[PDB]
Each structure stands twice: as C-alpha cells, then as structure tokens.
Ligand binder design. Sequence first.
Ligand SMILES: CNc1ccccc1S(C)(=O)=O
Length: 182
Amino acid sequence: MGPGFDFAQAIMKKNTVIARTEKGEFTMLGVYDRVAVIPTHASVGEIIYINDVETRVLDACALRDLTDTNLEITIVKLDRNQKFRDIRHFLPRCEDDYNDAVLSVHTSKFPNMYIPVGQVTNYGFLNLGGTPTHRILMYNFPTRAGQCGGVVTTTGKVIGIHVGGNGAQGFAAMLLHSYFTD
Ligand SMILES: CNc1ccccc1S(C)(=O)=O
C-alpha cells in the first residue's frame, strides 16, 4: 500500500521459502548463496522440506551470544540447486530501535500476509517459552501461531525474524550483518 510494504514485498518475492520441519511450517528467509535463517524452536534436523521438496541440511547452527545466551536464530545451509539473491547489505550492523516496521509471512496457512506492526523497541532480554533469550525486538501487535519466521523489515532494512508473542506484543530475534560474514 506504501513504501514499507514495497520493500517487504521485494524481500518476500525473492528471498523467502516455505520451510517444513516436524514442528510445522515456517516462513524462512534466504540471506545469500544457500544460507537461510529460521527460529531455533523449528528444531531443524538433517532433512527439511523447502517449498515441499525434500532437502538435505548441509549445516545448522543455533546462535548464542558471547554470554552463552540463546539468540533464537538458527542459520541453515541448504543442499539446494539455486542461490538466494544476496541481501546481506540490508542487514543492520548494530542493535537498534526502529520506526514503522512490517512483519511479512508466507505459508500454506497465511500466504502473502503483511502486517504493519509500527514502532519496534530494542527490548533486549526476554524469557521466551522458559528460555532466557537476548537481542529481542518488540512490537505492539497481537501476533498468533503461524507467524514464526516472519520477516521484520523497515524501508531499506531487514531487521529480524518473528519468534513469539504474549497475545498483546510480538517478539523478533535481531538479524545482524556480523552473523553472515563468510
Ligand atoms: C495472523 N493473524 C490473523 C489471521 C487471520 C485473521 C486475523 C489475524 S490478526 C493478526 O488480525 O489477529
């Protein structure tokens, strides 16, 4: 409807796949080459389904900060025959707050879904499903089940992936450029 939705759509149409694990269907953001991200609670194993195609997982790393605290991001390298468009230049370098974000989801259940979530706070610490978690972004939107892995963007930046909510607020794990240096 506006330039926020324009940038979100541009990311969704080229840099997302539908990922299916034994824990459900997730929006999955492809970042560069065959490297993608997904919430760690997706529990990626040796095989994952990508757009309903059986795909070998070449590597999967559940990220933690240097305090050894959960970040709720898993970086997956996929045995896919095609590279993602490289979007690492849209990732923030530092932890920050943002104005006017969009949460975008694409699954069987929620195709072509875009939500204007408004202001995004650097929330920091969250007890997420009982697990201490750092680098959390918060937005005042009542997100539900089905949105995990959704991409959080501003104009020009990809800032996070949706990992949970409390019925009133939604929570995203930060994406930082430093996670994807090769
Ligand atoms: C994904 N949530 C959803 C889905 C269908 C209808 C309404 C909603 S909402 C975000 O407005 O509570």
